[PDB]
Design an enzyme around this catalytic site. Structure first.
Site, PDB file in Angstrom:
ATOM      1  N   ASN C 351       0.537  -1.683  -0.347  1.00 25.21           N
ATOM      2  CA  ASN C 351      -0.218  -0.369  -0.099  1.00 25.21           C
ATOM      3  C   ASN C 351       1.063   1.155   0.020  1.00 25.21           C
ATOM      4  O   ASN C 351       1.680   1.405  -0.439  1.00 25.21           O
ATOM      5  CB  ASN C 351      -0.662  -0.150   1.334  1.00 25.21           C
ATOM      6  CG  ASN C 351      -0.119   0.427   2.857  1.00 25.21           C
ATOM      7  OD1 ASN C 351       0.829  -0.685   2.744  1.00 25.21           O
ATOM      8  ND2 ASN C 351      -0.650   1.407   3.071  1.00 25.21           N
ATOM      9  N   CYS C 353       1.760   2.577   2.749  1.00 20.89           N
ATOM     10  CA  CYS C 353       2.709   3.352   3.186  1.00 20.89           C
ATOM     11  C   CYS C 353       3.412   1.424   3.473  1.00 20.89           C
ATOM     12  O   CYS C 353       3.880   1.581   4.538  1.00 20.89           O
ATOM     13  CB  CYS C 353       2.114   3.678   4.942  1.00 20.89           C
ATOM     14  SG  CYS C 353       1.181   5.720   4.857  1.00 20.89           S
ATOM     15  N   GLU C 355       2.578  -1.276   4.681  1.00 23.51           N
ATOM     16  CA  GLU C 355       2.176  -1.945   5.999  1.00 23.51           C
ATOM     17  C   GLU C 355       1.490  -2.923   5.172  1.00 23.51           C
ATOM     18  O   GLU C 355       1.113  -4.216   6.106  1.00 23.51           O
ATOM     19  CB  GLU C 355       2.000  -0.977   6.585  1.00 23.51           C
ATOM     20  CG  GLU C 355       0.332  -0.993   7.151  1.00 23.51           C
ATOM     21  CD  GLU C 355       0.211   0.552   6.440  1.00 23.51           C
ATOM     22  OE1 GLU C 355      -0.661   1.147   6.498  1.00 23.51           O
ATOM     23  OE2 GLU C 355       1.035   0.658   5.499  1.00 23.51           O
TER      24      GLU C 355
END
EC number: 1.17.4.1
Lengths: 7, 663, 663, 7
Positions: C351, C353, C355
């Site tokens: 995604n 970020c 994670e």
């Protein structure tokens, strides 16, 4: 503003 | 020059002569780099050629390849003739025979009639037709008029998708965006507001650029249409401006004004003008004339917008036009009052080149396919002496053929989006045009601004309009009227000149035609929309469309007619080449040139735009749609421009101005 | 500082105290400028509040508003508390009670339990949940993982549409583009070729910017995912580069590498690497590990691409990362080998970020909603002396609550696109995280790099993973397992640590849980994905997530813990403020500070990234999805970086690197 | 190219 000019 | 025959003969030496075999190669073609079989001919045309190859191969007169000039043929080679692994497979006659089949399919008679007339330079079809006719996905149409689907991310992005799909194939776009809310407008479910049209425009600019891939000729530029009451109007008209923040411009799209009569009156009477967001003032683009003025004035009363001084906007418009040549000007009320498509609803835009006037909505994308008649080709010697006859009977009959062609195209076209197919199968608009008016006047020894030129202009367009309506009525007898014919002006026997409240010039029998039409209908809802003809006229060796020449030179393109005359007077020498370059291409104010030559070879900057506007006004009564009226200003002045606009406006022009070309 | 209570007390003086009445106002709100009624509360929550107002109003302890710091509360005011015509209507407790109801609906018990725990700072939900919970279109999810629908204008433009719809609401995007053909690739029905990913990327850049409207907080950035065999790879990774042609960059999107193990081996052994267009080499992104390496090597044999020196790419990647901090690094094979979602198909991206690790396809857009536990809040005094206990039982139980919350959200969410709803209703992934690891270590007097910190890290994540799986198994007993549970690793009793071939640490009973799970299933396919927590941790007053502190100062944010200690030694003075500013926030190499303080307040540039990587490796066995591993380099060197990457890579990290923060 | 460096 003029509508009467030589064009 | 003799460089033409050199290049042409050398193309002959590098190309197979048997048409059926070049079709074979084109159709069997395989991408060597990829191993992909990559046919350049449709199945159905390949077959047709095979089932008829003897008849086809022997109709081609390869001599006709020489009837092109150097600049002309190089235009053909550079962009038009189909290529195989980097170099030219097709001869000019092949391109022509291929286009002829792509148009007529199994009708070999017609196909041969089209081949012949085209190869003899009587007319030509638009670029997309030359590119794609006879090829697997034959996208032959030049024009798409797209409605912005809805004022929402979904609508915006659905529209953008559609425009990418259109631009990808051939075809320019006229896109109307009147229904998009302006800067500061409220958006439900958030406390941020809209940043208006400009950011949304930058999206379209970006997609316009993206859709332009490699071997350049997947173009299809965008013109965007806005009514001048829109609150974002001052930024809109500055799109092409050379300066200012590079995040507020949009240098690949064109602004076009969709101007109500009310705007012009407010300006004239030095009154007020009110900006609205479509949200705060709905329906403005869905009515015209009286309805709109009532509706508008009420919103004005109700305090729904921001009032300014009309001449503030006006001044800005003129400044954009001076500096950039845009925005274009098209009169929304002239277009609607005088359209045979008025039974469909309010028309909200023109097209990329301001000649098409057709109805569009979210589920209907207006399409047009275009062709142009080569006016000089109907010039004839009398029982000599004269050589001062125009053959209006030959012109009438070619127009008839071109009309039948443009109809076939409607049916044999591959539509890039479903909206375009739905639209065109319903109303079947068509668009005939012309090139070589300037040549024709010259050959007949007529100054552009003479009363003879003025008369010939009228007669020409009367016979094309007459011819096309006649050919079209014939088709409706064969196939029925187009789906929406009932209820049109034309069903009521109202034709285009009627809508200008004018008797036709009378060189043709309009009553019989009108009788036939009310009886049988027409196949086509519209038929005439004289267009720019940029590169097609270049291939034919004629001046752009219906405009005077811009020069008698170019780089060293020396006016064939000028030159002939200079020689017939010997006065053409070496210190002669010297003058027309040192002056941009004029002959006026030369010491030793007969007055009659001066009057005949007036350059468009030397012709009165009043003259220009009158002639467009004259021909406009026979123009179904509109035409791409470029205007040329010598030493532009804000007053000159204002006068020029109100003059055409008062003349009832639909397209008051295309480009403003200057100094 | 005392400026907090000043601002907070002053908010109190400008806001109504009765919650039901602030709900009333928010719900009755009307846009004065537009006359539009513009409710900021859903119908169903408004009703609920009205049907329960006594019970609701009196549960609120408005004292708890003071438990925020100055920077914290201003973060809340500036962006979080609902506003009415320009100024703040909600108190912190209102925001909290509103979020609690938006989550729990009619379950007033739960709602009150959530209100209480949140207001006491035990945990918090992600920003979109704080923004939107209880509001009319409650878009509560932070993450969307989008598959590029198809290598065609239709697919591209359909995807772009979808991304605009997502970005418009809350929610960042991870978009994978492996299936798009590269520069020079063949396009059927034209002799032009593709201009590759970069032009198409510029389209997305442009749409990312457009979707950002007014009162700024309709963001949602884009990360783009590409496997390094893609032929456009060298341009892709330079997207954020500070220089070069401004028509080849894309400064608002992030490059993320989706790296196969094969790439890393080729680099290591100093071998070859081959670029392909997805067209010339299909399926590469639809297999992983062995399958992919077989398939890849074959295409290599068959001459399908362009071979380079692997370390050429590698070198370029490192240079982009050094100069820009990107591209991010995520290991495609670690992600797939070790995902409970492997019964769905190959996962093609993470995604925004780095994670989330969830399955996406054209008809399925992976969504996740996130919340984070406040680790320091479980610190307790023993039977004093110690004050050196962590309450793992309280932590286990809060995690249980947070898991039930995140599940409610799945059901009460308004999905911006149908792909997102289809995806989430099917697999029901969830993502728990943490903030304040650094604080927690400090409060327990543990150096980040100590064996105690190392142990505590492990225990913490074991209990969160255990708790969440337990809470989730309970839900599956109430409502059934999620739709695709049968066939997952977890259905086979394989849990996350198993997939790392590790015995769990054993502070919790995994066999009983595992027994229960095989028996009853789980409600959630995934549960844990520790995330950046940027602004939520700021509101709570804790360090970002699971990273060490970057400084002991900031602008003059002085480490509360550092400061306490300095004072408890008197040595904190005025020429003391002087040092931690003059050095960027370090305490090392100060003349008069006890070694133990130095070891405890190590700055992240002073901690070994090897230590960092080990700890992420340790916790990763209990992490369902992945985590946002920022890496920090002192005096970056190409060799330092190469070592750091292969180290995490060999450790089996999924996310080898998020940002590279430097010097 | 080195995998053995102080980091």
């Amino acid at each position: 503003f003029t509508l009467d000019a030589d064009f | 020059t003799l460089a033409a025959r050199i290049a042409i003969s050398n193309l002959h030496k590098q190309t197979t002569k048997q048409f059926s075999k070049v079709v074979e190669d084109l159709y069997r073609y395989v991408n060597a780099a990829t191993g992909k079989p990559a046919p350049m001919i449709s199945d159905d045309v390949y077959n047709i050629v095979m089932e008829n190859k003897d008849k086809l191969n022997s109709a081609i007169v390869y001599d006709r390849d020489f009837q092109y000039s150097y600049f002309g043929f190089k235009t053909l080679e550079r962009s038009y003739l189909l290529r195989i692994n980097g170099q030219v497979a097709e001869r000019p006659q092949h391109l022509i025979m291929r286009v002829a089949l792509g148009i007529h399919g199994r009708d070999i008679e017609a196909a041969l009639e089209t081949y012949n007339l085209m190869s003899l330079k009587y007319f030509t079809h638009a670029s997309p037709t030359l590119f794609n006719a006879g090829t697997p996905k034959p996208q032959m149409s030049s024009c798409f008029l797209v409605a912005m689907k809805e004022d929402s991310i979904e609508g915006i992005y659905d529209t953008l998708k559609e425009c990418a799909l259109i631009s990808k194939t051939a075809g320019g776009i006229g896109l109307h965006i009147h229904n998009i809310r302006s800067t500061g407008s409220y958006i439900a479910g958030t406390n941020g507001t809209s940043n208006g049209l400009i950011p949304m425009i930058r999206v379209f600019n970006n997609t316009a650029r993206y859709v332009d891939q490699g071997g350049n000729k997947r173009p299809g530029a965008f013109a965007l249409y806005l009514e001048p009451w829109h609150a974002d109007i001052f930024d809109f008209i500055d799109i092409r401006k050379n300066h200012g923040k590079e995040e507020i411009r949009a240098r690949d799209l064109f602004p076009a004004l969709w101007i109500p009569d009310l705007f012009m009156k407010r300006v004239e009477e030095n009154g007020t003008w009110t900006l609205f967001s479509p949200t705060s003032a709905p329906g403005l683009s869905d009515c015209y004339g009286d309805e709109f003025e009532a509706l508008y004035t009420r919103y004005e009363k109700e305090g729904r917008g921001k009032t300014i001084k009309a001449q503030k906007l006006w001044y800005s418009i003129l400044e954009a036009q001076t500096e950039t040549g845009t925005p274009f000007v098209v009169y929304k009320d002239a277009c609607n009052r005088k359209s045979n498509q008025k039974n469909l609803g309010v028309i909200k835009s023109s097209n990329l080149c301001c000649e098409i006037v057709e109805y569009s909505a979210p589920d209907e994308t207006a399409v047009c396919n275009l062709a142009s008649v080569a006016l000089p080709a109907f010039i004839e010697t009398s029982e000599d002496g004269k050589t001062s006859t125009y053959n209006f009977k030959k012109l009438h009959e070619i127009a008839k053929v071109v009309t039948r062609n443009l109809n076939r195209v409607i049916d044999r076209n591959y539509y890039p989006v479903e909206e375009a197919r739905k639209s065109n199968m319903r109303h079947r608009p068509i668009a005939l045009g012309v090139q070589g008016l300037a040549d024709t006047f010259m050959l007949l020894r007529l100054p552009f601004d003479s009363e003879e030129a003025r008369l010939l202009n009228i007669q020409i367009f009367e016979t094309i309009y007459h011819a096309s309506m006649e050919a079209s009525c014939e088709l409706a007898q064969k196939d029925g009227p187009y789906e929406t014919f009932q209820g049109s002006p034309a069903s009521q026997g109202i034709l285009q000149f009627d809508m200008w409240d004018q008797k036709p010039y009378g060189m043709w029998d309009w009553d019989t035609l009108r009788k036939d039409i009310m009886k049988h209908g027409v196949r086509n809802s519209l038929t005439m929309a004289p267009m720019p003809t940029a590169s097609t006229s270049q291939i034919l060796g004629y001046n752009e469309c219906f405009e005077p020449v811009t020069s008698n030179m170019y780089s060293q393109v020396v006016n064939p007619y000028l030159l002939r005359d200079l020689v017939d007077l010997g006065i053409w020498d070496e210190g002669m080449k010297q003058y027309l370059i040192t002056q941009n291409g004029s002959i006026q104010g030369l010491p030793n040139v007969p007055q009659e030559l001066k009057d005949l070879y007036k350059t468009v900057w030397e012709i009165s735009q009043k003259t220009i506007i009158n002639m467009a006004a004259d021909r406009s009564v026979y123009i179904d749609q509109s035409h791409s009226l470029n205007l040329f200003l010598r030493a532009p002045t804000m007053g000159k421009l204002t006068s020029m606009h109100f003059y055409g406006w008062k003349k009832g022009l639909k397209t008051g101005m295309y480009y403003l070309r200057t100094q």
